[model samples]
Target: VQIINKKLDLSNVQSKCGSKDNIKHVPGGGSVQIVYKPVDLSKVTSKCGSLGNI
Candidate 1:
């Protein structure tokens, strides 16, 4: 498994993990790094939007 670090705005609407209730918050300007491993690249899809918006 490979680990990827991505700088992101934790306060953004799309930062939520699998569920909307898992949302996170962070101060503005400063970014956070999210690390995750992709078990299968074929199942990875990118969508940026709040829950129920996708």
Candidate 2:
């Protein structure tokens, strides 16, 4: 789909190639990555410091 000639705020990565010579088949390459982790905030807390003494 079109990004519509604008910078979309996105999580993304990229690529390409074609046949005019086999040299293009040998990639000019490198590596990229992301590290991800999840947490259970379902069991969480704060000691509300006498904000209204509710």
Candidate 3:
């Protein structure tokens, strides 16, 4: 397989998995999260969210 240098929108990656690592709370009340259930991404995206690509 070949990789590309184009920009794609996967801002919903974390949400794809309802895991604790997919969320965080700030000092005050700031929170971040996605909106999907985790999928078997092993044969899905061809790669994990590694490489700091997120």
Best by lDDT: 3
lDDT (10s digit) by residue, model 1, range 1-54:
999998876454533456433337666786775746535343546765555524
Per-residue CA lDDT of model 2 for 1-54, tens digit only, reads 666676678453233333333223335568444446644454434554454423
TM-score of each: 0.19, 0.17, 0.18
How are the candidates ranked when ordered by TM-score, highest leading?
1, 3, 2
- Best-to-worst lDDT order: 3, 1, 2
The list of candidate 3 runs beyond 4 A from truth reads 1-20, 30-32, 40-54
Worst 10 residues of 1 by lDDT: 14-23
Off by over 4 Å in 1: 1-23, 38-54
Better of 1 and 2 by lDDT: 1
lDDT against the true structure, each candidate: 0.55, 0.44, 0.56
TM-score of 2: 0.17
Compute the lDDT for candidate 3.
Answer: 0.56
Model 1 lDDT vs. the true structure?
Answer: 0.55
CA deviation > 4 Å runs, candidate 2: 1-29, 34-42, 52-54
Error of 3 at 16 (Å): 23
